[PDB]
Amino acid sequence: MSTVDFDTIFLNQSKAPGRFRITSSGLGWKPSSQVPTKGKTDPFLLPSGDILSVSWSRGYRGWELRVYTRNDKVIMLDGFEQQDFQQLKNEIQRTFNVNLEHKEHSLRGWNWGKTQLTRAELVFNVNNRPAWEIPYSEISNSNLTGRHEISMELNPKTVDENHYETLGDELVEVRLYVPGQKSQLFYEQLKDKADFDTTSEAIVSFEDILFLTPRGRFEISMYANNLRLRGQSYDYKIQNKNVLRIFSLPRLDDRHHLVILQVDPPLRQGQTRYPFLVMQFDRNEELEVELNLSDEEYKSKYEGKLNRSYGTDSTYKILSHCLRGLTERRVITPGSFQSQHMQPGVNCSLKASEGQIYLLDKCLFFATKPCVYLPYSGIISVVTSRGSRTFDIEVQFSGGSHTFANINKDEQKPIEDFLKGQGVRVKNE
Amino acid sequence: FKRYESYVRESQIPSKVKNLRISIDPKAQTIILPICGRPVPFHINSFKNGSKNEEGDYMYIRLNFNSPGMGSSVKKTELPYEDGDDKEFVRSLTFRSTNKERMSEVFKAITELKKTAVKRDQERKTMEDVVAQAQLVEFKGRPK
């Protein structure tokens, strides 16, 4: 029985070369024993019955043999020479009765084309030729980022007990622009074919929340590991780990309440970034909410962190408690600072933007686009300058200075005494 | 559409490209990107702009390409892509790498290649309206 073998072949972009073998039982690949690869030394084996079709095309390391399986998986074998094509074609035809297809790829350098959802891979065609293909197994998540914009996140190739170390620069995110009234249907079809986790059970949803940064009526759906923001033009998925801080701050109008999320990495809308999400509630808005949790899961994971049912209390309180319970982040409320007018903050302008400055126990926080967070540990000195019924506050820190202008002069003494109490160096010109 | 092309044949892809990494060809004015084990060319005219972010042990590069909606300052008379309502576009690709220094150099070289391309296109546009004149005939005596 003529076993045909190829040395120096790589499996799925493996860093280590291996020996590839064709047998009547199937395909085999084994890593070459010369590299200390912390990693199982077990041979990869693909049964002959699982092979659907095989394509030949140009890869990074020479020629690539791409094997399509009946289980909708794509196997990539790279490192072949151009001469190997005739031998491989004859052996694959003889052993598996499968034609080896030669697939030519577009080299034009154009970023426009047509996407084509094939059974196991997303194909991008440029002038009726494939430019690139992404296996559905490499897609971790997909999210509509605008009316014509689809963002696909790819599985980060890090450390998994079942995968060979990858060598090179890794693709993390692909954004497509699909014009016409069409991107929503493409997103639905991609979701069905990529087989993403289904029957998702949000623990709690909040409808029609009016944001300010960016301004929009978003639905907030909360899950065990992640928060989803659904909007008319943009869907966002935020991991609970990426929420750094939660602020719950009353607006000085005494009619509204602000809930502010600090997110790292900052949310993207096209080119603009939102490190802070600013939600605006009415103080008189009451909501009753039951958590969608089984009694066994509630007792084991969420007892003492979340209430099973929230009565008819203010929406911003319920939301702040749910965020605290799911993200394990402390909610920052207004500190011991009280303005001359007994208010928890002061009106000021940062450059051309009018807003409210909150002196919280650990930090100064400005709450109008752009949102500014300044921890007292990072502040070198605060300089009070005369512009006047108003005065200006320059906060100096290791990365620059921020001038807050148009502050009422009556608020000068309360602010100075509070900042001195927090151990901040105040200088009066 | 200003017709541009990176390569006509696979043999024009430099032998250097083999480490499954981002590489730049200044001769073909092309960025070669590692998409799922394939060396995908993108011409510098399809490239719009990019950003670089450092995150823990990794360096991220986002490359943005020309698409309708996110259009460049070019006039309606000359598009960097062919007109097409049914055409879908690669708007951005984000890559990561453990090697921060090289990834910073690659980003600088992409940015320089774009600057050189834009400068050459401006120089061409400034020369298009320069009519080649006849040669001045010197006076054979004492000129005024």
Nearest Cα to Cα of residue A54 among A70, A31, A35, A37 = A70
CA distance A405 to A19: 70
Check if the beta carbon of residue A236 is closer than 8 Å to that of residue A149: no
Q: Search chain B and give the residue with CA nearest A270.
A: B70
Which residues from chain B sit within 8 angstroms of residue A135, using beta carbons? 36
Parallel, antiparallel, or unpaired for β A100-102 and A51-58?
parallel
Parallel, antiparallel, or unpaired for β A139-146 and A129-135?
unpaired
Write the DSSP string, A214-277. Answer: TEEEEEEEE-SSEEEEE-SS-EEEEEGGGEEEEEEEE-TTSSEEEEEEEEEEEEEETTEEEEEE
- Could you tell me the resolution of this structure in angstroms? 3.9
Contacts with A249 (C-beta within 8 Å, 6 or more apart), sequence order = A257, A258, A259, A260, A333, A334, A344, A345, A358, A365, A367
**Cβ–Cβ pairs < 8 A, chains A and B:** 166
B63, HSE (Cβ side, Cα atoms, 13 Å) = 29
**Residue A63: how many other CB atoms lie within 10 Å:** 20
- How many Å lie between the alpha carbon of A229 and the closest alpha carbon of chain B? 22
Q: Search chain A and give the residue with CA nearest B95.
A: A171
Which DSSP state fits A411? G
CA distance B14 to A314: 64
Beta bridge partners, A132, equal A124
Check if the beta carbon of residue A33 is closer than 8 Å to that of residue A42: no
Which residues from chain A sit within 8 angstroms of residue B96, using beta carbons? 156, 169-170, 172
Q: Which helix (H) or strand (E) holds A283?
A: none
A313, HSE (Cβ side, Cα atoms, 13 Å) = 13
Task: Identify how the structure was determined.
Answer: cryo-EM
Tell me which residue has tokens 């689809």.
A150
Check if the beta carbon of residue A352 is closer than 8 Å to that of residue A280: no
Contacts with A39 (C-beta within 8 Å, 6 or more apart), sequence order = A31, A164, A165
Question: Hey, what are A270's tokens?
Answer: 């096209």
**Residue A149: how many other CB atoms lie within 10 Å:** 23
Check if the beta carbon of residue B43 is closer than 8 Å to that of residue B30: yes
Q: A397 φ, ψ to 5°?
A: -140, 170
What is the total residue count of chain B? 144
CA distance B48 to A178: 18
Nearest Cα to Cα of residue A112 among B124, B44, B142, B68 = B68
Q: How far is CA A123 from CA A116, B36, B43, in A?
A: 5, 11, 20
Three-state SS annotation for A129-196: EEEEEEEHHHEEEEEEEECCEEEEEECCCCCCCCCCCECCCEEEEEEEECCCCCHHHHHHHHHHHHCC
Helix, coil or strand: residue A378: helix
**Residue A176: how many other CB atoms lie within 10 Å:** 25
- The number of helix segments (H) and strand segments (E) in chain B equals 1, 6
CA distance A170 to A163: 15
* Partner B contacted by A115 (CB < 8 A): yes
Check if the beta carbon of residue A35 is closer than 8 Å to that of residue A16: yes
CA distance B61 to B40: 16
Nearest Cα to Cα of residue A298 among A203, A424, A407 = A203
* CB atoms A170 and B97 under 8 Å: yes
Q: Which of A56, A63, A107 to mutate to test the interface with B (most CBs of B within 10 A)?
A: A107
- Tell me, what amino acid is at A338? Q
Check if the beta carbon of residue A76 is closer than 8 Å to that of residue A157: no
CA distance A167 to B97: 10
Question: Hey, what are A363's tokens?
Answer: 């930090």
The 10 Å CB-count burial string (b at 16+, else e) for B37-51 is bbbbbbbbbbbbbbe
Which residues from chain B sit within 8 angstroms of residue A65, using beta carbons? none
- Tell me, what amino acid is at A152? M
- How many Å lie between the alpha carbon of B21 and the closest alpha carbon of chain A? 5
Parallel, antiparallel, or unpaired for β A379-386 and A426-428?
parallel
CA distance A317 to A286: 9
